A and B are shown apart, each in its own frame.
Chain A
Amino acid sequence: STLVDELESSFEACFASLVSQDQEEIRTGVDQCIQKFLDIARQTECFFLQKRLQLSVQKPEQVIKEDVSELRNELQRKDALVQKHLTKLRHWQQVLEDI
């Protein structure tokens, strides 16, 4: 129930051999803990993708809003890059003028 909590429990189970009071015991325990951990991680990602798919088919204006936001960040990032580059160009023109 509530895949978050299974993720938390499995993550705490990854450390159970260290926090208490040779090789093959460690190996099989590590393999089983890590495999259940990654399996519940993939199930959580699958849940988020299914919910995003249902939103993208039902309420498509939200997707367009996120695209608007990402294109605006692309614009601002491009202008920041060109401004830094332009300041470096003007500094190099002032350097190369002085030979």
Chain B
Amino acid sequence: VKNQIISQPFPSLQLSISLCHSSNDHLYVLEHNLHLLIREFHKQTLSSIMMPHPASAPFGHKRMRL
């Protein structure tokens, strides 16, 4: 809607994710995992897996080379 996402994963269930901006029932686990998920999503770009140890080898992920 504006700052609130509402989902219905199970039919009797309603999940709500809201960004509370103070501008001066809550589950902590999902908030903490949200921070870690976006942190892993950042670190995927800046990973050392993209580095090619063979100097001639161009670039990109390691298993995609394999």
Direct contact of A and B (CB under 8 A): no
Residue ranges of A at the interface with B (Cβ–Cβ < 8 Å): none
